């Protein structure tokens, strides 16, 4: 059997998170089904998001299942599979705050972003004159905004929506998503990476056909986020 290592953070509800001392979520269920279909011994390695892409290049993991958005720079540095989730980058503020209607309102504000994430680069590209006070983190991002240490943060709409409705955090969506994001699994451009890529695309396409991918998405979001 082929050993495959899947990097994640364990702090990305409901994609990858811990509850009752169990590492679970959307990314966990998906790669267990992939491992059934390709004779993989899947091994989950939890690490902060800022170092997941580093672990991938060094070779201590084989891929990452953590909503890795495909970017122009990441295309040149890694291989990617077919996108399995499509969404948009969302600004989210504290509940009751109407002083921030979108990304153009961040001038002079403090916006939290995960370090090394596509949301940081997008935010720095949307900061032409240094108006925004970008604060980068790996944990406690949505908590600083709900408490007041940061004015807003930028993630995907899906995860923020579940924190607002399911979890119940005192947060609200700030406007409409300003950038579509296509999320796929990155691979190292080597023999095993090319081998995993082609075999994962065949499993991903096979899961979309029989509805298994939709079953996983409905369990973790109530909505088929694969569509
Ligand atoms: Cl990312
Ligand atoms: Cl900096
Ligand atoms: K991302």
Residues 80, 90 share a domain: no
Burial degree of 81 (CB within 10 A; 0-12, 13-18, 19+): buried
Total structural domains within the chain: 2
Find the 174 Cα to ligand 1 centroid distance in Å. Answer: 20
Closest CA to 15 of 32, 4, 28, 34: 28
Residue 170 CB-half CA count within 13 A: 11
In the sheet with 40-46, reading across from the earlier edge strand, the strands are: 40-46, 2-8, 63-64
In sequence order, the β-bridge partners of residue 86 are: 182
Resolution, angstroms, 1 dp: 2.3
Show the domain range for 95.
86-180
Residues 74, 55 share a domain: yes
Q: How many Å apart are CA 200 and CA 197, to the nearest integer? A: 5
Instruction: Please indicate, yes or no, if residue 226 is contained in any of the structural domains.
Output: no
Q: How many Å apart are CA 105 and CA 121, to the nearest integer? A: 18
Q: Strand 16-19 relative to strand 22-24: parallel, antiparallel, unpaired?
A: antiparallel
Instruction: Please indicate, yes or no, if residue 227 is contained in any of the structural domains.
Output: no
Task: Report yes or no: 27 and 85 within 8 Å, Cβ to Cβ.
Answer: no
Look up residue 102 and give its two tokens. 């979108």
**How far from the centroid of its chain's Cα atoms is residue 97's Cα?**
25
Residues 167, 110 share a domain: yes
Provide the CATH number for the domain around residue 11. Answer: 3.40.190.10
**How far from the centroid of its chain's Cα atoms is residue 28's Cα?**
13
Instruction: Please indicate, yes or no, if residue 134 is contained in any of the structural domains.
Output: yes
Q: Coil, strand, or helix at residue 36?
A: helix
Closest CA to 107 of 130, 125, 91, 135: 130
Closest listed ligand to the CA of 15: 3
In order, the DSSP letters of 142-180 are HHHHHHTSSSEEEEEHHHHHHIIIII--SEEEESS-SSE
Closest listed ligand to the CA of 117: 1
Residues 120, 72 share a domain: no
Find the 67 Cα to ligand 2 centroid distance in Å. Answer: 23
Find the 53 Cα to ligand 1 centroid distance in Å. Answer: 9
Q: Coil, strand, or helix at residue 83?
A: coil
């Amino acid at each position: 059997a082929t050993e495959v290592k899947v990097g994640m953070s364990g702090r990305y509800f409901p994609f990858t998170f811990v509850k009752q001392d169990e590492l679970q979520g959307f990314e966990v269920d998906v790669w267990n089904e992939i491992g059934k279909r390709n004779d993989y011994k899947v091994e989950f390695v939890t690490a902060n998001f800022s170092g997941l892409l580093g672990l991938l290049e060094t070779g201590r993991i084989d891929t990452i299942s953590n909503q890795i958005t495909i970017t122009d720079a990441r295309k040149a540095k890694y291989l990617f599979s077919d996108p399995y989730v499509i969404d948009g980058a969302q600004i989210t503020v504290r509940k009751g705050n109407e002083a921030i209607k979108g990304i153009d309102d961040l001038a002079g504000k403090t916006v939290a972003v995960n370090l090394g994430s596509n949301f940081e680069q997008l935010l720095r590209n949307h900061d032409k004159d240094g108006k925004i006070n970008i604060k980068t983190y790996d944990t406690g991002i949505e908590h600083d905004v709900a408490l007041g240490r940061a004015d807003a943060f930028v993630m995907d709409r899906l995860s923020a929506l579940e924190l607002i409705e399911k979890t119940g955090l005192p947060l609200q969506l700030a406007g409409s998503p300003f950038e579509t994001i296509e999320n796929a699994w990155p691979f190292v451009n080597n023999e095993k990476g090319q081998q995993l890529q082609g075999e994962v695309n065949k499993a991903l396409a096979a899961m979309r056909a029989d509805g298994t991918l939709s079953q996983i998405a409905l369990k973790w979001f109530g909505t088929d986020i694969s569509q």
